[PDB]
Amino acid sequence: MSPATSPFLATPRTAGIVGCPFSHSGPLQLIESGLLNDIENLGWTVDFAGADALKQPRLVSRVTKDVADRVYAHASKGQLTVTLGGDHSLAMGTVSGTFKAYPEACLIWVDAHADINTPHTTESGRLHGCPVSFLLGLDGIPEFSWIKPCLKPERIVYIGLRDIDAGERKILKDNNIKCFSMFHVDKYGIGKVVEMALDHVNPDRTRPIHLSFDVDALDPVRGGLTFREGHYICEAIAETNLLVSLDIMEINPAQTVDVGRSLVRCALGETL
């Protein structure tokens, strides 16, 4: 079973907030929308640097390193780091910092896309579908030196997959990565899916959890997670007390701000 209280966090509960608008204005809108106050109402103390805190590989590395550092700063302090993102490639940074601080963490990746392409399978070229390939370590080394492969393939699980967008269906099977696609969600229901996901990466419920949630996995033809399912993922993870890092990615400014806000509150311990 899971611990009655978090074995990782700092005794004065602190939410670290890092926004990175790389791709939009969604992280700023969410911040404008009362997210900070919501978090505080739940008994959390907020560490936010203020609303100024927020191929093309040359620049994709810079920003992700920036994120990797800020995330670790919060991570190395017992905070739960909430990364408010644009692009999911930013998970290169968020996961680096988190695993830097928690080498024994596991990663739950919620997205319609596997984002697992090597630069040798990319074809598109946008670093958007490559971040997992660097974290798993098969890069190809060049101007991505700060990245150490901090993620074993048995430590990642995917929920919500539908279009393999730069996330090769061969790469996934070669490295034996557990994937729960929309077919499996339909089949089993999100209830059983989340439990199987937890049992795969975290069977003894003793590993810190990194929940990297991309809002593109959601829906308002109608083939993504419902809002309720995206919410249950956040609740179910929350009930374990194992969560140390939360990404809310690709927010994109209509009521996807209110959705992002709801999932944050939920992930942080709004049980209701």
PDB file of C-alpha atoms in Angstrom:
ATOM      1  CA  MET A   1       0.000   0.000   0.000  1.00  0.00           C
ATOM      2  CA  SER A   2       0.964   3.721  -0.028  1.00  0.00           C
ATOM      3  CA  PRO A   3       2.312   5.821   2.926  1.00  0.00           C
ATOM      4  CA  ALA A   4      -0.188   7.743   5.099  1.00  0.00           C
ATOM      5  CA  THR A   5       1.936  10.846   4.499  1.00  0.00           C
ATOM      6  CA  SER A   6       4.656  11.911   2.036  1.00  0.00           C
ATOM      7  CA  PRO A   7       8.077  10.344   2.831  1.00  0.00           C
ATOM      8  CA  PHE A   8       9.821  12.850   0.541  1.00  0.00           C
ATOM      9  CA  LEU A   9       8.455  16.403   1.011  1.00  0.00           C
ATOM     10  CA  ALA A  10       9.537  19.135   3.456  1.00  0.00           C
ATOM     11  CA  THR A  11       7.606  19.349   6.736  1.00  0.00           C
ATOM     12  CA  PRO A  12       6.492  22.847   5.899  1.00  0.00           C
ATOM     13  CA  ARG A  13       4.655  21.866   2.638  1.00  0.00           C
ATOM     14  CA  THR A  14       5.930  23.906  -0.299  1.00  0.00           C
ATOM     15  CA  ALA A  15       4.784  24.071  -3.910  1.00  0.00           C
ATOM     16  CA  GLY A  16       7.524  25.126  -6.315  1.00  0.00           C
ATOM     17  CA  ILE A  17       6.235  26.908  -9.376  1.00  0.00           C
ATOM     18  CA  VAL A  18       8.186  27.155 -12.620  1.00  0.00           C
ATOM     19  CA  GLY A  19       6.538  28.511 -15.750  1.00  0.00           C
ATOM     20  CA  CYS A  20       8.074  28.235 -19.202  1.00  0.00           C
ATOM     21  CA  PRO A  21       6.093  29.714 -22.143  1.00  0.00           C
ATOM     22  CA  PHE A  22       8.196  27.849 -24.768  1.00  0.00           C
ATOM     23  CA  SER A  23       6.643  26.357 -27.940  1.00  0.00           C
ATOM     24  CA  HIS A  24       2.522  30.042 -24.958  1.00  0.00           C
ATOM     25  CA  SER A  25       0.581  32.440 -22.724  1.00  0.00           C
ATOM     26  CA  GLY A  26      -1.163  29.533 -20.958  1.00  0.00           C
ATOM     27  CA  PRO A  27       1.248  29.272 -18.046  1.00  0.00           C
ATOM     28  CA  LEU A  28       0.804  33.045 -17.494  1.00  0.00           C
ATOM     29  CA  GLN A  29      -3.012  32.879 -17.757  1.00  0.00           C
ATOM     30  CA  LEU A  30      -3.202  29.997 -15.279  1.00  0.00           C
ATOM     31  CA  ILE A  31      -1.051  32.068 -12.921  1.00  0.00           C
ATOM     32  CA  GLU A  32      -3.282  35.106 -13.472  1.00  0.00           C
ATOM     33  CA  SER A  33      -6.380  32.923 -12.909  1.00  0.00           C
ATOM     34  CA  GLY A  34      -5.858  32.283  -9.186  1.00  0.00           C
ATOM     35  CA  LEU A  35      -3.824  29.072  -9.254  1.00  0.00           C
ATOM     36  CA  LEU A  36      -1.471  30.527  -6.633  1.00  0.00           C
ATOM     37  CA  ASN A  37      -4.356  31.282  -4.264  1.00  0.00           C
ATOM     38  CA  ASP A  38      -5.927  27.833  -4.903  1.00  0.00           C
ATOM     39  CA  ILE A  39      -2.679  26.156  -3.908  1.00  0.00           C
ATOM     40  CA  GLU A  40      -2.346  28.250  -0.756  1.00  0.00           C
ATOM     41  CA  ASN A  41      -5.996  27.558   0.232  1.00  0.00           C
ATOM     42  CA  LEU A  42      -5.060  23.860   0.253  1.00  0.00           C
ATOM     43  CA  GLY A  43      -2.465  24.463   2.965  1.00  0.00           C
ATOM     44  CA  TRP A  44       0.514  24.758   0.602  1.00  0.00           C
ATOM     45  CA  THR A  45       3.153  27.529   0.733  1.00  0.00           C
ATOM     46  CA  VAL A  46       4.038  28.949  -2.671  1.00  0.00           C
ATOM     47  CA  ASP A  47       7.548  29.509  -3.972  1.00  0.00           C
ATOM     48  CA  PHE A  48       7.087  31.504  -7.196  1.00  0.00           C
ATOM     49  CA  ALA A  49       9.655  33.946  -8.639  1.00  0.00           C
ATOM     50  CA  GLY A  50       6.904  36.311  -9.810  1.00  0.00           C
ATOM     51  CA  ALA A  51       5.273  36.660 -13.218  1.00  0.00           C
ATOM     52  CA  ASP A  52       8.687  37.362 -14.783  1.00  0.00           C
ATOM     53  CA  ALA A  53       9.866  33.855 -13.868  1.00  0.00           C
ATOM     54  CA  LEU A  54       8.626  32.834 -17.311  1.00  0.00           C
ATOM     55  CA  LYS A  55      14.994  21.917 -35.293  1.00  0.00           C
ATOM     56  CA  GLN A  56      16.234  25.090 -33.559  1.00  0.00           C
ATOM     57  CA  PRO A  57      18.310  22.778 -31.337  1.00  0.00           C
ATOM     58  CA  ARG A  58      20.738  25.531 -30.232  1.00  0.00           C
ATOM     59  CA  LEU A  59      17.889  27.235 -28.348  1.00  0.00           C
ATOM     60  CA  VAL A  60      15.921  24.105 -27.362  1.00  0.00           C
ATOM     61  CA  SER A  61      18.889  23.083 -25.202  1.00  0.00           C
ATOM     62  CA  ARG A  62      19.221  26.475 -23.502  1.00  0.00           C
ATOM     63  CA  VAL A  63      15.598  26.674 -22.289  1.00  0.00           C
ATOM     64  CA  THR A  64      15.416  23.016 -21.172  1.00  0.00           C
ATOM     65  CA  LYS A  65      18.634  23.468 -19.172  1.00  0.00           C
ATOM     66  CA  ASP A  66      17.111  26.598 -17.632  1.00  0.00           C
ATOM     67  CA  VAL A  67      14.085  24.521 -16.613  1.00  0.00           C
ATOM     68  CA  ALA A  68      16.229  21.574 -15.439  1.00  0.00           C
ATOM     69  CA  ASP A  69      18.057  23.916 -13.083  1.00  0.00           C
ATOM     70  CA  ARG A  70      15.024  25.760 -11.664  1.00  0.00           C
ATOM     71  CA  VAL A  71      13.215  22.467 -11.144  1.00  0.00           C
ATOM     72  CA  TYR A  72      16.184  21.033  -9.234  1.00  0.00           C
ATOM     73  CA  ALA A  73      16.380  24.192  -7.099  1.00  0.00           C
ATOM     74  CA  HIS A  74      12.815  23.561  -5.967  1.00  0.00           C
ATOM     75  CA  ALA A  75      13.422  19.772  -5.968  1.00  0.00           C
ATOM     76  CA  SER A  76      16.577  19.989  -3.814  1.00  0.00           C
ATOM     77  CA  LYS A  77      14.485  21.650  -1.082  1.00  0.00           C
ATOM     78  CA  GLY A  78      11.600  19.245  -0.454  1.00  0.00           C
ATOM     79  CA  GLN A  79       9.257  21.233  -2.642  1.00  0.00           C
ATOM     80  CA  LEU A  80       6.746  19.695  -5.022  1.00  0.00           C
ATOM     81  CA  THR A  81       7.750  21.385  -8.308  1.00  0.00           C
ATOM     82  CA  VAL A  82       4.763  22.338 -10.456  1.00  0.00           C
ATOM     83  CA  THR A  83       6.048  23.011 -13.977  1.00  0.00           C
ATOM     84  CA  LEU A  84       3.586  25.037 -16.002  1.00  0.00           C
ATOM     85  CA  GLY A  85       4.519  24.541 -19.577  1.00  0.00           C
ATOM     86  CA  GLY A  86       4.166  25.182 -23.150  1.00  0.00           C
ATOM     87  CA  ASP A  87       5.820  22.343 -24.982  1.00  0.00           C
ATOM     88  CA  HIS A  88       6.230  18.803 -23.676  1.00  0.00           C
ATOM     89  CA  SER A  89       9.888  18.761 -24.850  1.00  0.00           C
ATOM     90  CA  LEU A  90      10.374  20.865 -21.698  1.00  0.00           C
ATOM     91  CA  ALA A  91      10.070  17.514 -19.882  1.00  0.00           C
ATOM     92  CA  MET A  92      13.734  17.112 -20.783  1.00  0.00           C
ATOM     93  CA  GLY A  93      14.378  19.743 -18.134  1.00  0.00           C
ATOM     94  CA  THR A  94      11.648  18.917 -15.631  1.00  0.00           C
ATOM     95  CA  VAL A  95      12.595  15.211 -15.542  1.00  0.00           C
ATOM     96  CA  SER A  96      16.339  15.950 -15.357  1.00  0.00           C
ATOM     97  CA  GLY A  97      15.978  18.178 -12.287  1.00  0.00           C
ATOM     98  CA  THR A  98      13.505  15.845 -10.579  1.00  0.00           C
ATOM     99  CA  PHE A  99      15.575  12.698 -11.167  1.00  0.00           C
ATOM    100  CA  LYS A 100      18.752  14.583 -10.295  1.00  0.00           C
ATOM    101  CA  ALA A 101      17.140  15.024  -6.902  1.00  0.00           C
ATOM    102  CA  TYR A 102      15.256  11.721  -7.031  1.00  0.00           C
ATOM    103  CA  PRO A 103      17.309   9.113  -8.924  1.00  0.00           C
ATOM    104  CA  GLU A 104      14.845   6.522  -7.695  1.00  0.00           C
ATOM    105  CA  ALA A 105      11.766   8.343  -9.025  1.00  0.00           C
ATOM    106  CA  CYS A 106       9.385   6.933 -11.615  1.00  0.00           C
ATOM    107  CA  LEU A 107       7.710   8.805 -14.485  1.00  0.00           C
ATOM    108  CA  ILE A 108       4.067   8.818 -15.524  1.00  0.00           C
ATOM    109  CA  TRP A 109       3.701  10.472 -18.866  1.00  0.00           C
ATOM    110  CA  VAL A 110       0.229  11.578 -19.931  1.00  0.00           C
ATOM    111  CA  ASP A 111       0.083  12.524 -23.615  1.00  0.00           C
ATOM    112  CA  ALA A 112      -1.427  11.569 -26.951  1.00  0.00           C
ATOM    113  CA  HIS A 113       2.174  11.314 -28.156  1.00  0.00           C
ATOM    114  CA  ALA A 114       5.076   9.111 -27.087  1.00  0.00           C
ATOM    115  CA  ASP A 115       7.631  11.858 -27.915  1.00  0.00           C
ATOM    116  CA  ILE A 116      10.322   9.148 -28.044  1.00  0.00           C
ATOM    117  CA  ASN A 117      11.980   9.774 -31.418  1.00  0.00           C
ATOM    118  CA  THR A 118      15.752   9.767 -31.713  1.00  0.00           C
ATOM    119  CA  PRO A 119      17.170  12.525 -33.939  1.00  0.00           C
ATOM    120  CA  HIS A 120      17.806   9.525 -36.214  1.00  0.00           C
ATOM    121  CA  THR A 121      14.067   8.823 -36.516  1.00  0.00           C
ATOM    122  CA  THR A 122      12.644  12.338 -36.025  1.00  0.00           C
ATOM    123  CA  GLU A 123      11.988  13.189 -39.717  1.00  0.00           C
ATOM    124  CA  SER A 124       9.878  16.185 -38.595  1.00  0.00           C
ATOM    125  CA  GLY A 125      12.846  17.801 -36.854  1.00  0.00           C
ATOM    126  CA  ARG A 126      11.017  19.544 -34.029  1.00  0.00           C
ATOM    127  CA  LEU A 127      12.675  18.602 -30.741  1.00  0.00           C
ATOM    128  CA  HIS A 128       9.066  18.204 -29.553  1.00  0.00           C
ATOM    129  CA  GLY A 129       8.979  14.458 -30.192  1.00  0.00           C
ATOM    130  CA  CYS A 130      12.460  13.687 -28.871  1.00  0.00           C
ATOM    131  CA  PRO A 131      12.667  14.387 -25.122  1.00  0.00           C
ATOM    132  CA  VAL A 132      12.238  10.804 -23.969  1.00  0.00           C
ATOM    133  CA  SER A 133      14.979   9.588 -26.299  1.00  0.00           C
ATOM    134  CA  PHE A 134      17.484  11.850 -24.498  1.00  0.00           C
ATOM    135  CA  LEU A 135      16.315  10.915 -20.984  1.00  0.00           C
ATOM    136  CA  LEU A 136      16.592   7.227 -21.881  1.00  0.00           C
ATOM    137  CA  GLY A 137      19.996   7.999 -23.343  1.00  0.00           C
ATOM    138  CA  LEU A 138      20.461   7.103 -26.977  1.00  0.00           C
ATOM    139  CA  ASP A 139      21.115  10.663 -28.236  1.00  0.00           C
ATOM    140  CA  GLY A 140      22.068  10.460 -31.907  1.00  0.00           C
ATOM    141  CA  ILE A 141      26.628  13.964 -27.574  1.00  0.00           C
ATOM    142  CA  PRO A 142      26.610  17.390 -29.222  1.00  0.00           C
ATOM    143  CA  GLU A 143      25.317  20.531 -27.480  1.00  0.00           C
ATOM    144  CA  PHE A 144      23.160  18.335 -25.220  1.00  0.00           C
ATOM    145  CA  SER A 145      25.933  17.568 -22.729  1.00  0.00           C
ATOM    146  CA  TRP A 146      24.195  18.621 -19.497  1.00  0.00           C
ATOM    147  CA  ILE A 147      21.753  15.763 -20.081  1.00  0.00           C
ATOM    148  CA  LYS A 148      22.594  12.507 -18.358  1.00  0.00           C
ATOM    149  CA  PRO A 149      20.301   9.549 -19.116  1.00  0.00           C
ATOM    150  CA  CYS A 150      18.461   9.549 -15.802  1.00  0.00           C
ATOM    151  CA  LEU A 151      15.500   7.384 -16.843  1.00  0.00           C
ATOM    152  CA  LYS A 152      15.474   3.586 -17.116  1.00  0.00           C
ATOM    153  CA  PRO A 153      12.872   2.251 -19.624  1.00  0.00           C
ATOM    154  CA  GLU A 154      11.115   0.316 -16.845  1.00  0.00           C
ATOM    155  CA  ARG A 155      10.612   3.551 -14.899  1.00  0.00           C
ATOM    156  CA  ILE A 156       8.378   5.220 -17.519  1.00  0.00           C
ATOM    157  CA  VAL A 157       4.709   4.519 -18.283  1.00  0.00           C
ATOM    158  CA  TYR A 158       2.477   6.152 -20.903  1.00  0.00           C
ATOM    159  CA  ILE A 159      -1.251   6.836 -20.474  1.00  0.00           C
ATOM    160  CA  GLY A 160      -3.477   8.359 -23.157  1.00  0.00           C
ATOM    161  CA  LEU A 161      -1.480   7.457 -26.274  1.00  0.00           C
ATOM    162  CA  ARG A 162      -3.210   7.564 -29.668  1.00  0.00           C
ATOM    163  CA  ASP A 163      -1.074   9.167 -32.396  1.00  0.00           C
ATOM    164  CA  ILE A 164       2.541   8.035 -32.299  1.00  0.00           C
ATOM    165  CA  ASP A 165       3.822  11.555 -33.023  1.00  0.00           C
ATOM    166  CA  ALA A 166       7.584  11.182 -33.228  1.00  0.00           C
ATOM    167  CA  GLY A 167       7.270   8.347 -30.723  1.00  0.00           C
ATOM    168  CA  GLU A 168       8.110   5.272 -32.782  1.00  0.00           C
ATOM    169  CA  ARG A 169       6.014   2.160 -32.201  1.00  0.00           C
ATOM    170  CA  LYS A 170       9.226   0.169 -32.752  1.00  0.00           C
ATOM    171  CA  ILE A 171      11.351   2.125 -30.252  1.00  0.00           C
ATOM    172  CA  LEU A 172       8.672   1.604 -27.580  1.00  0.00           C
ATOM    173  CA  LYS A 173       8.622  -2.179 -28.054  1.00  0.00           C
ATOM    174  CA  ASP A 174      12.406  -2.559 -28.390  1.00  0.00           C
ATOM    175  CA  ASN A 175      12.902  -0.933 -24.978  1.00  0.00           C
ATOM    176  CA  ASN A 176       9.925  -2.721 -23.427  1.00  0.00           C
ATOM    177  CA  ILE A 177       8.198   0.432 -22.211  1.00  0.00           C
ATOM    178  CA  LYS A 178       4.699  -0.050 -20.752  1.00  0.00           C
ATOM    179  CA  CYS A 179       2.121   1.872 -22.785  1.00  0.00           C
ATOM    180  CA  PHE A 180      -1.538   2.384 -21.966  1.00  0.00           C
ATOM    181  CA  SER A 181      -3.191   3.835 -25.005  1.00  0.00           C
ATOM    182  CA  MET A 182      -6.787   5.014 -25.442  1.00  0.00           C
ATOM    183  CA  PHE A 183      -7.636   1.479 -26.576  1.00  0.00           C
ATOM    184  CA  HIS A 184      -6.513   0.211 -23.143  1.00  0.00           C
ATOM    185  CA  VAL A 185      -8.276   3.047 -21.379  1.00  0.00           C
ATOM    186  CA  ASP A 186     -11.499   2.153 -23.186  1.00  0.00           C
ATOM    187  CA  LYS A 187     -10.895  -1.533 -22.565  1.00  0.00           C
ATOM    188  CA  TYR A 188     -10.096  -1.407 -18.856  1.00  0.00           C
ATOM    189  CA  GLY A 189     -11.348   2.004 -17.695  1.00  0.00           C
ATOM    190  CA  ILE A 190      -8.960   4.643 -16.303  1.00  0.00           C
ATOM    191  CA  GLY A 191      -9.383   3.114 -12.851  1.00  0.00           C
ATOM    192  CA  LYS A 192      -7.652  -0.139 -13.627  1.00  0.00           C
ATOM    193  CA  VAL A 193      -5.260   1.577 -16.025  1.00  0.00           C
ATOM    194  CA  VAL A 194      -3.819   3.853 -13.364  1.00  0.00           C
ATOM    195  CA  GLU A 195      -3.399   0.973 -10.943  1.00  0.00           C
ATOM    196  CA  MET A 196      -1.585  -1.148 -13.562  1.00  0.00           C
ATOM    197  CA  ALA A 197       0.596   1.861 -14.382  1.00  0.00           C
ATOM    198  CA  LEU A 198       1.464   2.291 -10.712  1.00  0.00           C
ATOM    199  CA  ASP A 199       2.128  -1.434 -10.370  1.00  0.00           C
ATOM    200  CA  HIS A 200       4.487  -1.360 -13.330  1.00  0.00           C
ATOM    201  CA  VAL A 201       6.749   1.547 -12.352  1.00  0.00           C
ATOM    202  CA  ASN A 202       6.063   1.600  -8.615  1.00  0.00           C
ATOM    203  CA  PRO A 203       4.985  -1.856  -7.409  1.00  0.00           C
ATOM    204  CA  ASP A 204       5.974  -1.329  -3.739  1.00  0.00           C
ATOM    205  CA  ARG A 205       4.697   2.264  -3.661  1.00  0.00           C
ATOM    206  CA  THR A 206       8.083   3.498  -2.435  1.00  0.00           C
ATOM    207  CA  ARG A 207       9.329   5.531  -5.442  1.00  0.00           C
ATOM    208  CA  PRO A 208       8.822   9.299  -5.803  1.00  0.00           C
ATOM    209  CA  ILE A 209       6.396  10.005  -8.669  1.00  0.00           C
ATOM    210  CA  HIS A 210       6.955  12.476 -11.505  1.00  0.00           C
ATOM    211  CA  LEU A 211       3.622  13.109 -13.213  1.00  0.00           C
ATOM    212  CA  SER A 212       4.209  14.823 -16.535  1.00  0.00           C
ATOM    213  CA  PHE A 213       0.738  15.802 -17.763  1.00  0.00           C
ATOM    214  CA  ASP A 214       0.125  17.211 -21.243  1.00  0.00           C
ATOM    215  CA  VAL A 215      -3.262  18.788 -21.739  1.00  0.00           C
ATOM    216  CA  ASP A 216      -3.328  17.645 -25.397  1.00  0.00           C
ATOM    217  CA  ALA A 217      -4.234  14.189 -24.031  1.00  0.00           C
ATOM    218  CA  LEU A 218      -7.583  15.662 -23.020  1.00  0.00           C
ATOM    219  CA  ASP A 219     -10.866  16.586 -24.714  1.00  0.00           C
ATOM    220  CA  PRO A 220     -13.302  19.521 -24.102  1.00  0.00           C
ATOM    221  CA  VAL A 221     -13.808  12.709 -33.148  1.00  0.00           C
ATOM    222  CA  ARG A 222     -13.782  12.830 -29.321  1.00  0.00           C
ATOM    223  CA  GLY A 223     -10.957  10.273 -28.881  1.00  0.00           C
ATOM    224  CA  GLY A 224      -8.857  11.715 -26.048  1.00  0.00           C
ATOM    225  CA  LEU A 225      -9.183  11.358 -22.260  1.00  0.00           C
ATOM    226  CA  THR A 226     -12.290  13.034 -20.789  1.00  0.00           C
ATOM    227  CA  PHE A 227     -11.706  15.732 -18.195  1.00  0.00           C
ATOM    228  CA  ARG A 228     -12.881  13.336 -15.474  1.00  0.00           C
ATOM    229  CA  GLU A 229     -10.226  10.768 -16.518  1.00  0.00           C
ATOM    230  CA  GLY A 230      -7.477  13.409 -16.554  1.00  0.00           C
ATOM    231  CA  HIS A 231      -8.710  14.395 -13.111  1.00  0.00           C
ATOM    232  CA  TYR A 232      -8.816  10.835 -11.744  1.00  0.00           C
ATOM    233  CA  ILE A 233      -5.199  10.359 -12.860  1.00  0.00           C
ATOM    234  CA  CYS A 234      -4.245  13.387 -10.747  1.00  0.00           C
ATOM    235  CA  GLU A 235      -6.358  12.279  -7.804  1.00  0.00           C
ATOM    236  CA  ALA A 236      -5.189   8.667  -7.914  1.00  0.00           C
ATOM    237  CA  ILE A 237      -1.581   9.771  -7.985  1.00  0.00           C
ATOM    238  CA  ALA A 238      -2.333  12.271  -5.199  1.00  0.00           C
ATOM    239  CA  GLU A 239      -3.747   9.601  -2.908  1.00  0.00           C
ATOM    240  CA  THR A 240      -0.392   7.721  -2.967  1.00  0.00           C
ATOM    241  CA  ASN A 241       1.537  10.596  -1.316  1.00  0.00           C
ATOM    242  CA  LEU A 242       4.437   9.696  -3.662  1.00  0.00           C
ATOM    243  CA  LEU A 243       4.188  12.724  -5.984  1.00  0.00           C
ATOM    244  CA  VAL A 244       7.189  15.086  -5.959  1.00  0.00           C
ATOM    245  CA  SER A 245       6.903  16.662  -9.423  1.00  0.00           C
ATOM    246  CA  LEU A 246       4.015  17.700 -11.630  1.00  0.00           C
ATOM    247  CA  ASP A 247       4.184  19.078 -15.158  1.00  0.00           C
ATOM    248  CA  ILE A 248       1.089  20.649 -16.691  1.00  0.00           C
ATOM    249  CA  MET A 249       2.102  21.100 -20.322  1.00  0.00           C
ATOM    250  CA  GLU A 250       0.663  22.600 -23.531  1.00  0.00           C
ATOM    251  CA  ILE A 251      -1.976  24.580 -21.624  1.00  0.00           C
ATOM    252  CA  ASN A 252      -2.705  27.031 -24.506  1.00  0.00           C
ATOM    253  CA  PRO A 253      -4.988  29.957 -23.434  1.00  0.00           C
ATOM    254  CA  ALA A 254     -10.246  28.370 -23.906  1.00  0.00           C
ATOM    255  CA  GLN A 255     -11.300  26.912 -20.540  1.00  0.00           C
ATOM    256  CA  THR A 256      -8.068  24.935 -20.683  1.00  0.00           C
ATOM    257  CA  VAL A 257      -6.822  27.312 -17.977  1.00  0.00           C
ATOM    258  CA  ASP A 258      -9.612  26.267 -15.617  1.00  0.00           C
ATOM    259  CA  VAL A 259      -8.893  22.648 -16.538  1.00  0.00           C
ATOM    260  CA  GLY A 260      -5.168  23.032 -15.816  1.00  0.00           C
ATOM    261  CA  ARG A 261      -6.033  24.706 -12.539  1.00  0.00           C
ATOM    262  CA  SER A 262      -8.367  21.919 -11.518  1.00  0.00           C
ATOM    263  CA  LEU A 263      -5.732  19.219 -12.220  1.00  0.00           C
ATOM    264  CA  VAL A 264      -3.091  21.115 -10.230  1.00  0.00           C
ATOM    265  CA  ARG A 265      -5.324  21.492  -7.137  1.00  0.00           C
ATOM    266  CA  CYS A 266      -6.244  17.873  -7.473  1.00  0.00           C
ATOM    267  CA  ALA A 267      -2.714  16.596  -7.922  1.00  0.00           C
ATOM    268  CA  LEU A 268      -1.668  18.565  -4.854  1.00  0.00           C
ATOM    269  CA  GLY A 269      -4.339  17.089  -2.599  1.00  0.00           C
ATOM    270  CA  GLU A 270      -7.751  18.590  -3.236  1.00  0.00           C
ATOM    271  CA  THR A 271      -9.779  15.436  -2.520  1.00  0.00           C
ATOM    272  CA  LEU A 272     -13.307  16.870  -2.323  1.00  0.00           C
TER     273      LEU A 272
END
